[PDB]
């Protein structure tokens, strides 16, 4: 009665039930399996899905809007995709639907992030193949040594009213291309923090206004978290973003937790019992009660594949 260990999965939530799909361990987890975690009790439940089952992937980007699951991109056995899936989780045994969206989709990619705002799914960044698009792409020279890949700063809207892709004209200093950054939404602000770009794992924090499409760099007073990728960034209030884990430039696995205070524009390191449990490429979801549920991810450097310590642990932070 317990999901198998994994990194690079997806977790999304309604604040009470956490849904978990995909990822890989030591290859991929079964595509048709949808593990559900009750946040109040603490038990699991696996359901097989039918329909347009998406392929088994890592680095996919997923959201829950009114108990409907949406999924974009990721990396499967044959590379990155820009396929978009939804899955109504209110219904019968659940069924995936692959939406053949109108307009020009994002390039195929993984390890990106998304903001939910009104009718809009707004995607940012990623790693995948070369894109006639709005934004900048930046090759990762190590991927030439097949299909070479790289990072982008693309912003993409999927309007769920007509399921049509588009790109907003943004103003301001957009963050550099990046992937394995973390995205968080509060009101009309799409926060992105950290991520890997070229040869760094970064500590910069920006937000995109989802009304005015203005990019703003935030410069907090005092101590900031160390640069990182594969971290999780979670809204826990109208005013606080909860950050945990990740992976540094110098390949350190991270176990530190922080809250970003939006009103104060200040970081606050959060002390917790899980300091021996660093994680990366895990997922985080907020509970309605007031918690952040960390599931899965790896404990050490996942880049050493044959030694990777992938996890099925639930970590619970009282924020």
């Amino acid at each position: 009665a317990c999901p198998a260990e994994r990194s690079g999965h997806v977790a999304v939530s309604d604040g009470r039930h956490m849904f978990v799909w995909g990822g890989y361990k030591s290859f991929y987890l079964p595509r048709e399996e949808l593990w559900i975690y009750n946040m109040e009790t603490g038990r699991w439940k696996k359901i097989n899905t039918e329909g347009d089952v998406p392929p088994s992937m890592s680095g996919s980007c997923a959201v829950c809007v009114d108990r409907v699951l949406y999924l974009f991109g990721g990396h499967h056995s044959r590379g990155n995709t820009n396929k978009f899936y939804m899955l109504d989780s209110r219904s019968r045994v659940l069924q995936w639907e692959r939406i053949d969206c109108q307009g020009i989709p994002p390039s195929s990619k993984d390890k990106l992030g998304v903001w939910v705002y009104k009718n809009k799914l707004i995607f940012f960044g990623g790693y995948g193949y070369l894109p006639k698009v709005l934004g900048t792409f930046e090759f990762d020279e190590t991927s030439f040594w097949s299909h070479p890949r790289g990072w982008n700063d693309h912003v993409h809207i999927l309007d769920t009213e007509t399921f049509t892709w588009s790109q907003p004209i943004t103003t301001g200093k957009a963050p550099s291309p990046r992937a394995a950054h973390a995205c968080a939404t509060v009101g009309n602000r799409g926060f992105v923090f950290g991520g890997r770009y070229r040869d760094a794992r970064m500590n910069d924090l920006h937000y995109l206004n989802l009304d005015t499409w203005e990019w703003n760099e935030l410069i907090p007073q005092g101590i900031c978290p160390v640069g990182r990728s594969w971290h999780s960034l979670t809204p826990v209030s109208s005013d606080h973003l909860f950050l945990f884990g990740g992976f540094t430039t110098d390949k350190q696995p991270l176990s530190d937790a922080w809250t970003y205070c939006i009103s104060k524009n200040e970081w606050i390191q959060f002390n917790h019992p899980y300091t021996e449990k660093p994680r990366l490429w895990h997922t985080a979801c907020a509970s309605d009660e007031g918690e952040v549920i960390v599931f899965g991810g790896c404990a050490n450097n996942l880049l050493v594949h044959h030694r990777a310590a992938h996890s099925n642990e639930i970590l619970i932070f009282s924020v």
Partner: peptide, 6 residues
Amino acid sequence: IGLLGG
């Protein structure tokens, strides 16, 4: 695999 670029 999917590890790259993070």
